Each structure stands twice: as C-alpha cells, then as structure tokens.
Amino acid sequence: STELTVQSERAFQKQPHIFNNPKVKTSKRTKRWYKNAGLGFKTPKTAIEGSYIDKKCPFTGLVSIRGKILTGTVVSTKMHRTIVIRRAYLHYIPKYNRYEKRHKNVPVHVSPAFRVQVGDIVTVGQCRPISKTVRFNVVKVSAAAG
C-alpha cells in the first residue's frame, strides 16, 4: 500500500474550494484542508502532512461521521481505499438458554492516512452512503496481535 504522486487520474485531484494562489508564494507551496471528526477522535499526522486527496476521508474530505461507531477486525484488505471488517458476536437462543456465534461483514472505507492489514482490530464509524454497500469510514486503528 504505497501511493504514488497521487495526481494520476484522468481528472485533477484537489479538495474543493481549496485555492493556493499562483501570484502569492509560501514556503510549502500549496495549502491543505483537514478537520476534526469529533467524538474524541485524533485526526492523525499523515492526514495533515500527506499528499492524498480522498474526497471520502473522515478528515481532509467531504464526509462527516454521525450515528453509530463500531469495532471489529480486518478480514479483507484486497479492495482499494475500502476494506472488509468482521464484527463477531454471540446470539441468545432462549429455548436452550444458550448462545450461538453469528457474525456480519461490514465494508468500510479506509483513508490512505491509515495503514491496515489482515489482522488489526480497528474502530470504524458510520458516515452516509458513500458506496453501494459501504456506510462506514475507518476513524481509528490499533495494532494487530502477537
């Protein structure tokens, strides 16, 4: 997961209404717009200091996290800028006064700010339909396992 100079698309990649003037000159030539997701979620280093665009990123992008916030472990990284999380849970079946183990998979967009891999319990939260299946964005990432 190493992104290039990030300007490779048939379209130009820039955050909306972010204009660094050609006439005026600064030390780092172009500006950067990041934000604060809220709910005590640290908007990380790579976002502010990265080159990426990602109009779908929880920061540096046009989405907004509201509603549920969920956890679960990364299953599939195979996609691009989205991933699959697996939230395991039990289920109470009263007749036998016992539990059965169910599970659900959540497709979730992942910012190029974060780096995730098969492993990796990860915190994720819901922002609007971004694509088809995906209602959730990766807002927080811990390490994997031993």
């Binding site: 300007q7 698309e9 048939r10 379209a11 130009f12 820039k14 204009f19 660094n20 003037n21 050609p22 006439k23 172009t30 497709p107 088809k132 299946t133």
Partner: protein, 188 residues
C-alpha cells in the same frame, strides 16, 4: 421511467431479489441533456415539489472566473478539449462539469490592460496613479500569458449545465493548468 432504486440491483451476496413493488416517482431519474456549443437554448424541468431544474441544450457564452485576479467576465466558450470521463464528449463537444473547455480570452485580456496598463504577452493622469500602485503584482505566468497570444484560454466548467442552466467555470491556473497541459500534448 428510469429508476434510481437499489432493489433492481443484486445483493452484495450476489443474489437476485424478486420485484417487491412497482416503480414510484420519487425514485425516478430522467434523461441527460447533452449540452453542446450553440445559440443559447435552455429548457425548464419541473422538479420534485414544483421548483425548476434548467436543461442546458445549446450553450455558448457563459461566466468564467480568473482565480488570482478576483474578477469574472463573460466569454464565448469555443469548444471542449479534454474530459476525464469520456472523450466522446470531447469529440462530440458536449458541455458537462470537469469539462476543460476553451473560452474567448479577449474580455479577459481587456480587463488586464485597462487595469495593470501593460499590454499582454509581448493619458488621463489619474490612471498612471493607479497603474503605479498595482505594479509588482503584474507578472502572471509564462503558461497563463501565452494563451492570450492565441486569443483563447484554458477553462474548466464548474457548473452542472443540464441542472442549473448556466455553464460556468474558471480559467486553469497553477499546477492544475500544468496537469491538463501534460495531457493535451502527451495525449493528442
């Protein structure tokens, strides 16, 4: 009519779901108006809840903005050149967003020479007052000046012509100007 529903689609598991109900107006969609250069013709659409969308059909001459100058004048919009989605729009010269068109540069040339006083790219004592102050900001770009020699400038449609009815944009500057240049020459 066209349907925006997600239930004609397949489930993420892949299964094909039975038709649960009929089509309802609020999930509809309508036909693109593929707006091309020409004597202005704009059709009204009666939207949801009344109101109006405006179909761009033939669009010449709409508003454009020179970013760094902070000024906006109206010009002709010759045609398209590039387009990230479909070259078909280039070839057919259709106007949408992200268009990268070419516009009349002359009303954009006039403002400059009647402001900064330098003719572009080669009495009234109250005027030399002003032109004195505004200098030292009077260098634009090597890449933004050269197009004034031709008479047409590189601009990108930022409106949604089939929606608003206006076709508007902003002249290309900075690296964004460079990005589409490295396209036009290394593509065509």
């Amino acid at each position: 009519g066209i349907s925006r529903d997600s239930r004609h689609k397949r489930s993420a598991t892949g299964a094909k779901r039975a038709q649960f109900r009929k089509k309802r107006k609020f999930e509809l969609g309508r036909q693109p108006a593929n707006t091309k250069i020409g004597a202005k013709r704009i059709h009204s659409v009666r939207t949801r809840g009344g109101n109006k969308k405006y179909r761009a059909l033939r669009i010449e001459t709409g508003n454009f903005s020179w970013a760094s100058e902070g000024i906006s004048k109206k010009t002709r919009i010759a045609g398209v050149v590039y387009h990230p989605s479909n070259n078909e729009l280039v070839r057919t010269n259709t106007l949408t967003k992200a268009a990268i068109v070419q516009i009349d540069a002359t009303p954009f040339r006039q403002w400059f020479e009647a402001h900064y006083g330098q003719t572009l790219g080669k009495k009234s004592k109250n005027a030399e007052r002003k032109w004195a102050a505004r200098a030292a900001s009077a260098k634009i770009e090597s890449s933004v000046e050269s197009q004034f020699s031709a008479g047409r400038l590189y601009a990108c449609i930022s409106s949604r012509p089939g929606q608003s009815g206006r076709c508007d944009g902003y002249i290309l500057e900075g690296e964004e100007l460079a990005f589409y240049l490295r396209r036009l020459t290394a593509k065509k």
